[PDB]
Design a protein around this nucleic acid. Structure first.
Ligand SMILES: [K+]
Ligand SMILES: [K+]
Ligand SMILES: [K+]
Ligand SMILES: [K+]
Ligand SMILES: [K+]
Ligand SMILES: [K+]
Ligand SMILES: [Mg+2]
Ligand SMILES: [Mg+2]
Ligand SMILES: [Mg+2]
Ligand SMILES: [Mg+2]
Lengths: 238, 51, 142, 62, 208, 126
RNA sequence: AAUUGUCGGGAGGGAAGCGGAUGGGGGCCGGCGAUGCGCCCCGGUCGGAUGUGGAACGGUGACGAGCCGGUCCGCCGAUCG
RNA sequence: GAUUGUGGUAGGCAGCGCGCGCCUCCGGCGUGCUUCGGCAUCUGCGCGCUCCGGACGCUGGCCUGUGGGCUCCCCAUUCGA
RNA sequence: GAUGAGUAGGAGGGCGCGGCGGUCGCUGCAAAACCUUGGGCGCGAGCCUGGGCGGAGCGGCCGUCGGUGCAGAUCUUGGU
């Protein structure tokens, strides 16, 4: 019939080459995905075992200290969760600047913060505007699972797949949600990168309300360090 | 010299489902959750039977 | 188009005697094109009957279900009187569709508008049929 | 409310297309838009950006 | 062919056994040993070539949008535990509102097949939506009632005069139902009387 | 003609944005004007006052400018301008211009019936 | 247009007017709201090859050759649409 | 219990069943590691299923009607002003 | 993907009026103007249209121009 013009032939040939290379890439991706699934399964198993072992070790250490007649001082918290409880109206310069540096720009936003003398002293200046404590494993896991959003190219992307986490944190070995949870809870060597990767959590208003946000938690208010009791507030806020 | 043409970049955003409610999403994010749930259920059943 | 069609489009996309615009230049703006060699009467470079060397013309001939299929000759752009290769088809719709396909896509004339040419042929054929026997159904059922 | 400057929007203005009505310049801009998109060449990106600039920002060379 | 499920479900979507135990139970090891240490490769099923559809008579000017695939398939309607064969139901809507009727079975469509019996309260064999019914604690034996031949198609309209065949079938069905009802004292009067709310009667406190 | 539109038409507001105090002074027309007064309660958006239009009221782009019948309007002044809609009869309807004579209106109506083009005012001047 | 008379509807315990939500009454609207589609049987009209000739012509090529091709008209078969 | 379905060329992603072995079929039979419970250790293909890349399905009423709709008009009422 | 307050003030994109160079049209089978609890479009400036009246002209689009947009000024003239 009609002879095929050379331009159409060239286009078809190049399209065939592109299809072949795409198919090869897809096959390689599928194989590596299978390997990654096995790896993340094993890693999650190991992390769960580690958490259980740490809890048991803490209980045993306390019991042994009591038996010996002495005292065991628990290791100080290495991680904090900070929730803004005041609005953005009528802000003093230093407080506003510190709250931006903590990435708390909206009321009821939440962020993790590694415990440090510099960070602790920064938080001391804004104590009236926030409440914070020591998050639970359940708290961290639920926050990351339900409201965890990653920052890719300065955009907010929901963590619906492990590929989103991988694209940003594969250089550091974090390629799955469980890896991210472990890095956050343990404050691993790459805690900074993983934490910055997490978009500030946008929490809802507390389910049961607040007591009084104009007073410190010690006086019966809500501001300040409420230590292990931050977890119930997180339950009501997530 | 042009790079291969792309036709699958404009994918609609995947709807976010909470892994804490539906099982398939949780398994997709964390396959070990299946084993964890299975072991927890079996242990609870064994304890109830023993009681 | 004695000059490349892209330049002609750059010139005429702003204004031309075949351009029909209504309802201002806001969100309400509606644009159409009147030139007979525009299959969809759309003001776009793809369908433009002024900025393309190869164009398809499909319109109803005067009488007897005769549909005019014409294509601009590629080497006669400077000769308006002999620019169109006119073919008048008087046969059934199937033969007309086959001829339109052969003259539009099978020869690689303008494959990108094969669907537009077929739809235009169908619309013209339906219009001729209705014009002969009049309206017999409302065509409102989905 | 959210503590952002101008709601997080940019306040810098840069040229995104030529202000000229020269059709040939527009065709060149289309050419180099395609080149930039489908090659990712730094040279092509620089050429495209400079094609937008004003007269005083395209000084002559002796 | 295996006659029993290999992996019973603890809950929806979770099996009782793991991948290792499933490997052992499924016999993949046996298949590999029989085939010579390698699994048997099965060729992909050949697709059926599309039929030579005739050319269209018309060509639309617009490309109609094809809807995206919906992977959810509806499941059969659930029947409340309080409703079991022979249970007495109270109709809360329609021309038979308040009537007390006997439940026979649930049809394929999910509607409930009930009878008055027709003689007792004038309610014939009928379909009632479960959402417009209250299931009480009164149960009557219906083992002797045969309604196998009656299904959702029995009530389908053919589009004024009731055929005699339906009357005969209703009489045949209701004979055994009335025979069973007569066993329980005062059940005839109960089924012949409608349910109503009197003064200081609270629906949320009645047990039914 | 079966309209191509499928999404339902949703109006964020069906009431007109009437100029403040146009009910009070006859000389003040209804056509919207944004108050610029320093003390204007309408400009300050005091609750219970006249509402001011804003871009937030914008109609969905998919259903914007669509008539209730599901088509978009195009004004036609003669039968020749009618053929422009031959390939767009599922999205566009024709409205005959108010100044067209009845004689030409009959020809336009006949041609549109031939072309299966909806006319919004085909009974005018009949 | 301000303003006024008449007729008809309506409201009125020291203003009227106005924003939002329904309702009563009135007024208006038939693109206000469809009746088509597919598969078969009967009857009526119009045309029917990859064959053979004629008229004009096109795609590509190099507004050459070669190759390929559609429209229309007349014939032998085909007996379909 | 309540609000809601935005999109419209994908059978993808994740998890899992049936056949490719047998027996006496609420189950049992092979190789390794086990905390002796168990284990992503063997986990491949074909056909299928699901909480799995954003709603689908059935029925009824009505279609010139005292029907349906209304951004139009006059009023009444709750809140605002 | 993120985000949305705005006087003084700045800017962008649009709406509207009257001419000029072009182009496409309408009109005694009824133009402009005016009237109307007729209808519709636009967030809006506004726009399209039914009906009436009127009885001779008028509009759309692309450029371009201007004595080009009123609620106020104890504003002007006229009318009430
Ligand atoms: K006024
Ligand atoms: K504004
Ligand atoms: K629901
Ligand atoms: K003009
Ligand atoms: K009007
Ligand atoms: K002008
Ligand atoms: Mg937020
Ligand atoms: Mg204070
Ligand atoms: Mg007056
Ligand atoms: Mg002047």
């Amino acid at each position: 019939g009609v002879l095929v013009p050379e331009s159409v032939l060239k286009k078809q040939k190049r399209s065939e080459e592109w299809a072949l290379v795409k198919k090869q890439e897809l096959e390689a991706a599928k194989k590596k995905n299978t390997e990654n699934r096995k790896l993340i399964y094993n890693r999650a198993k190991q992390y769960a075992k580690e958490y259980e072992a740490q809890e048991r070790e803490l209980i045993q250490l306390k019991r042994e200290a009591r038996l010996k007649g002495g005292f065991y001082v628990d290791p100080e918290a290495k991680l904090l969760f900070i929730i803004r409880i005041r609005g953005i109206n009528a802000m003093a310069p230093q407080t506003k600047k510190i709250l931006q540096l903590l990435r708390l720009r909206q009321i009821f936003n939440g962020v993790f913060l590694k415990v440090n003398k510099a960070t602790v002293n920064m938080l001391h200046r804004v104590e009236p505007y926030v409440t914070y404590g020591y998050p639970n494993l359940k708290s961290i896991r639920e926050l990351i699972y339900k409201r965890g959003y990653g920052k890719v190219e300065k955009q907010r992307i929901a963590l619906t797949d492990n590929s989103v986490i991988e694209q940003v944190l594969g250089k550091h070995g974090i390629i799955c949600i469980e890896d991210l949870v472990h890095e956050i809870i343990t404050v691993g060597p790459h805690f900074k990168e993983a934490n910055n990767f997490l978009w500030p959590f946008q929490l809802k208003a507390p389910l049961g309300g607040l007591k009084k946000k104009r007073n410190h938690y010690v006086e019966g208010g809500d501001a300040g360090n409420r230590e292990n009791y931050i977890n119930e507030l997180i339950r009501r806020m997530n | 010299v042009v790079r291969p043409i792309k036709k699958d970049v404009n994918k609609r955003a995947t709807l976010k489902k909470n892994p804490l409610k539906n099982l398939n999403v949780l398994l997709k994010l964390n396959p070990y959750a299946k084993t964890a749930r299975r072991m927890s259920l079996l242990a609870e059943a064994q304890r109830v039977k023993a009681k | 188009t004695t000059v490349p069609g892209q330049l002609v489009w750059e010139i005429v996309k702003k204004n031309n005697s075949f351009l029909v615009k209504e309802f201002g230049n806001g969100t309400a703006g509606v644009v159409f094109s009147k030139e007979p060699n525009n299959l969809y009467n759309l003001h776009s470079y793809k369908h433009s009957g002024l900025a393309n060397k190869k164009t398809v013309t499909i319109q109803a001939e005067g009488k007897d279900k005769s549909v005019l299929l014409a294509t601009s000759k590629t080497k006669k752009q400077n000769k308006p009187s002999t620019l169109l290769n006119k073919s008048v088809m008087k046969k059934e719709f199937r033969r007309m569709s086959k001829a339109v396909t052969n003259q539009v896509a099978d020869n690689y004339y303008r494959p990108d508008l094969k669907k537009a040419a077929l739809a235009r042929l169908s619309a013209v054929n339906r219009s001729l049929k209705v014009a002969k026997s009049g309206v017999k159904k409302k065509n409102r059922q989905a | 409310g959210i503590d952002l400057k101008a709601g997080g929007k940019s306040k810098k203005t840069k040229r995104t297309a030529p202000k000229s009505d020269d059709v040939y310049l527009k065709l060149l801009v289309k050419l180099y838009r395609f080149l930039v998109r489908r090659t990712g060449s730094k040279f092509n990106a620089v050429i495209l950006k400079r094609l937008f600039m004003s007269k005083i920002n395209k000084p002559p060379l002796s | 062919a295996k006659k029993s499920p290999r992996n019973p479900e603890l809950i929806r979507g979770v099996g009782k056994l793991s991948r290792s135990k499933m490997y052992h139970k499924k016999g993949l090891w046996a298949i590999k040993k029989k085939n010579g240490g390698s699994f048997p490769v099965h060729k992909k099923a050949a697709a059926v070539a599309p039929p030579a559809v005739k050319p269209p008579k018309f060509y639309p000017a617009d490309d109609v949008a094809k809807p995206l695939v919906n992977k959810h398939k509806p499941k059969p309607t659930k029947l409340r535990a309080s409703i079991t064969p022979g249970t007495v139901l109270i109709i809360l809507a329609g021309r038979f509102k308040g009537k007390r009727v006997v439940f026979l079975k649930q049809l394929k469509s999910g509607l409930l097949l009930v009878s008055g019996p027709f003689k007792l309260n004038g309610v014939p064999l009928r379909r009632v939506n479960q959402a417009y019914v209250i299931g009480t604690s009164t149960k009557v034996d219906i083992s002797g009632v045969n309604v196998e031949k009656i299904d959702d198609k029995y009530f389908a309209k053919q589009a004024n005069v009731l055929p005699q065949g339906k009357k005969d079938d209703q009489k045949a069905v209701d004979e055994a139902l009335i025979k069973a009802v007569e066993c329980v004292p005062e059940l005839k009067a109960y089924l012949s009387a409608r349910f109503s709310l009197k003064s200081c009667m609270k629906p949320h406190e009645l047990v039914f | 003609a079966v309209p191509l539109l499928t999404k339902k038409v949703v109006k964020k507001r069906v009431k007109r944005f009437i100029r403040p105090q146009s009910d009070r002074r006859i000389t003040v027309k209804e056509s919207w004007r944004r108050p610029k007064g320093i003390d204007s309660r309408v400009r300050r958006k005091f609750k219970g006052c006249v509402l001011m239009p804003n871009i937030g009221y914008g109609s969905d782009k998919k259903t914007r400018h669509y008539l209730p019948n599901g088509f978009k309007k195009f004004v036609v002044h003669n039968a020749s301008e009618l053929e422009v809609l031959m390939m767009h009869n599922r999205t566009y309807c024709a409205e005959i211009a108010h100044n067209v004579s009845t004689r030409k209106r009959k020809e336009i109506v006949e041609r549109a019936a031939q072309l299966d083009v909806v006319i919004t005012n085909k009974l005018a001047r009949l």
